Design an enzyme around this catalytic site. Sequence first.
Site, PDB file in Angstrom:
ATOM      1  N   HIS A  30      -6.196  -2.145   3.039  1.00  0.00           N
ATOM      2  CA  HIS A  30      -6.830  -2.698   4.233  1.00  0.00           C
ATOM      3  C   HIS A  30      -5.965  -2.814   5.486  1.00  0.00           C
ATOM      4  O   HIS A  30      -6.418  -3.360   6.490  1.00  0.00           O
ATOM      5  CB  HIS A  30      -7.418  -4.076   3.920  1.00  0.00           C
ATOM      6  CG  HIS A  30      -8.486  -4.058   2.871  1.00  0.00           C
ATOM      7  ND1 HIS A  30      -9.644  -3.323   3.002  1.00  0.00           N
ATOM      8  CD2 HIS A  30      -8.581  -4.704   1.686  1.00  0.00           C
ATOM      9  CE1 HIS A  30     -10.410  -3.519   1.942  1.00  0.00           C
ATOM     10  NE2 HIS A  30      -9.788  -4.354   1.128  1.00  0.00           N
ATOM     11  N   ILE A  60      -5.697  -5.460  10.679  1.00  0.00           N
ATOM     12  CA  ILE A  60      -6.028  -5.901   9.337  1.00  0.00           C
ATOM     13  C   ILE A  60      -7.538  -5.905   9.177  1.00  0.00           C
ATOM     14  O   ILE A  60      -8.267  -6.525   9.958  1.00  0.00           O
ATOM     15  CB  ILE A  60      -5.487  -7.321   9.064  1.00  0.00           C
ATOM     16  CG1 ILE A  60      -4.007  -7.389   9.419  1.00  0.00           C
ATOM     17  CG2 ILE A  60      -5.655  -7.674   7.601  1.00  0.00           C
ATOM     18  CD1 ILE A  60      -3.430  -8.760   9.287  1.00  0.00           C
ATOM     19  N   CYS A  61      -8.015  -5.194   8.171  1.00  0.00           N
ATOM     20  CA  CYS A  61      -9.440  -5.160   7.936  1.00  0.00           C
ATOM     21  C   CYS A  61      -9.744  -6.318   7.010  1.00  0.00           C
ATOM     22  O   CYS A  61      -9.585  -6.209   5.791  1.00  0.00           O
ATOM     23  CB  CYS A  61      -9.853  -3.837   7.291  1.00  0.00           C
ATOM     24  SG  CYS A  61     -11.635  -3.641   7.138  1.00  0.00           S
ATOM     25  N   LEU A  62     -10.158  -7.434   7.601  1.00  0.00           N
ATOM     26  CA  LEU A  62     -10.485  -8.626   6.831  1.00  0.00           C
ATOM     27  C   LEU A  62     -11.654  -9.338   7.492  1.00  0.00           C
ATOM     28  O   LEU A  62     -11.605  -9.667   8.679  1.00  0.00           O
ATOM     29  CB  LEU A  62      -9.274  -9.556   6.759  1.00  0.00           C
ATOM     30  CG  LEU A  62      -9.211 -10.466   5.532  1.00  0.00           C
ATOM     31  CD1 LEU A  62      -9.026  -9.614   4.284  1.00  0.00           C
ATOM     32  CD2 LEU A  62      -8.068 -11.452   5.668  1.00  0.00           C
TER      33      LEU A  62
END
Length: 133
Positions: A95, A102-104
């Site tokens: 991610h 940040i892919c969150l």
Amino acid sequence: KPSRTVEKHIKTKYNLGNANYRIQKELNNFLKNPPINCTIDVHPSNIRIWIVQYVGLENTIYANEVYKIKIIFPDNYPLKPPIVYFLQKPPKHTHVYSNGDICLSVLGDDYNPSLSISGLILSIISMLSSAKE
């Protein structure tokens, strides 16, 4: 309540209703309940900018590899989430991207004013603990 303290923005009295107030409250909690293996340091003369440094948990593929995570608190924080991402030399993870993004869900479409910075960061730390690469 670990973490010691380099310089205090904790001192300065922030208007009992401004964005800085909440940010300051978030800083103190960060010093008192640090996310495992993290330290901190805020920009002098600008409480809006934080830089956390996370030293990889020994029991993970990131063991002992120091990484930095910057936090930018926008104008309308905590209504608009804080801008969080890794700095120069991101960790190669599913991610995480080259620029450090940040892919969150938590940092965007699932964020809500009540999330704690220490928590956002701790969530990130557990995200790093998983799989290989």
